[PDB]
Symmetry: C2
Subunit: 214 residues, 2 copies
């Protein structure tokens, strides 16, 4: 049964087409998961499932939609008692031999105990940064002077174990409004020194966000 | 009028020799700044200048020393009324024509007024997150499964304006004990556009940390 889910706004035609292209090109099955967007449904879900996050001003409603989308997929993994689920965001580009990693789960099943608490990142692992070209301050000795900003780290491609899905659901439900942070910080950065929770990284990575590739 | 300071533990003979080699090779003047290490001197400086950081258990005393070292150099920029100061950490490797940037300052003077609030990063901006090898779970299709151990950003090579030295001193003094993080993490989080503080990036970069080179 299919374990690959791609989080995507139902109306995002171009992204969905780019996702269909790449997955079918390598014969990798997947299903779209309709992303939560600023809407009655998202407001309602925040209220019932994560009231703490509803009251948090530090995240935009779009960031809250993305968070809700990952959260409800973790909940699907638990409710359906899946060993793991593999989640993507809809701007990913698949690397060369991605079919070997994503089309079948045997390689995971022989490696991991899925009751253990872990996430395996599939995407690139550079520190999350973006450059903005600017024209007003001229280059020197053939080097540009760009404007550097930080952004949130990627949650665009990962395998999550049933163990970690339970752990992250419990954690998100327990966080106070004040403790709410971007999904990547809670999932990755804030767990780096946790007892049971491991973050693994496929190295080299097998997928990359389109923006990150630039 | 020397602008270049290299943060280095006084006893780190090999790093200092590698720094002398590269800087003298390109005729770039510089001074070592004796890095603060776990010691009475560091404890004293933390107490006088950053009591908030003294009380932070989330950081090792070495991380506190590194932070104090950058902080006191920012303070020297202001106290000595330098236009800017250029800071390095002692594992840096200089690229080809670094002398054009580091031995002369007119290029900076014609681009900026030094009471503008900016940092210009000189080191690489593509920086992998820190991964740790593990042996208990075998690789698949020539990809390793590594463990995420930290997300550190480089503070090994940058120009800071007197404007930004004042801004960063004020910011560091204002952080609560709870908000204290390693210097690179704080500075990483300051790279945003909703500020008067700008971070520029030299592209391509002119230096790299030797460990990063892999
Ligand atoms: O209202 C929305 C808007 C977007 N998304 C979804 O969010 C995902 C990522 O979209 P983008 O690539 O446009 O956004 P980013 O890659 O910039 O988001 C990145 O940074 C975010 C914070 O700004 C998150 O923390 C996240 O880890 C990370 O992938 C997509 O699947 C998209 O469908 C929603 O679920 N709801
Ligand atoms: O007690 C100490 C130890 C080190 N340093 C200074 O810290 C700088 C960086 O030292 P290393 O490269 O040995 O430390 P890391 O290998 O940890 O360096 C990188 O990794 C760190 C992650 O913990 C930080 O992000 C740091 O800024 C980053 O450049 C050097 O100038 C060193 O002199 C001190 O001031 N005091
Ligand atoms: Mg993205
Ligand atoms: Mg270093």
């Amino acid at each position: 049964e299919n374990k690959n889910f791609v989080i995507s706004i139902s109306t995002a035609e171009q992204r969905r087409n780019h996702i269909i292209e790449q997955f079918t090109h390598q014969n990798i099955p997947f299903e779209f998961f309709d992303a939560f967007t600023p809407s009655d449904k998202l407001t309602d879900h925040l209220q019932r499932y994560l009231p703490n996050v509803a009251n948090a001003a530090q995240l935009t409603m779009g960031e809250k939609g993305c968070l809700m989308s990952h959260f409800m997929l973790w909940k699907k993994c638990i409710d359906e008692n899946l060993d793991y689920i593999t989640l993507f965001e809809d701007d990913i580009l698949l690397g060369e031999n991605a079919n070997k990693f994503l089309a079948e789960g045997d390689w995971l099943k022989v490696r991991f105990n899925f009751q253990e608490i872990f996430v395996l990142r599939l995407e690139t692992f550079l520190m999350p940064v973006q450059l903005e070209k600017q024209t007003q301050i001229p280059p020197f000795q053939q080097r540009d002077i760009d404007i550097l900003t930080s952004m949130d780290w990627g949650t665009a491609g990962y395998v999550i174990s049933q163990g970690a899905a339970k752990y992250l659901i419990a954690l998100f439900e327990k966080l106070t409004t004040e403790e709410i942070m971007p999904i990547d910080e809670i999932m990755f950065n804030q767990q780096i020194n946790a007892t049971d929770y491991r973050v693994y990284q496929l190295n080299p990575a097998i997928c990359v966000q389109e923006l990150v590739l630039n």
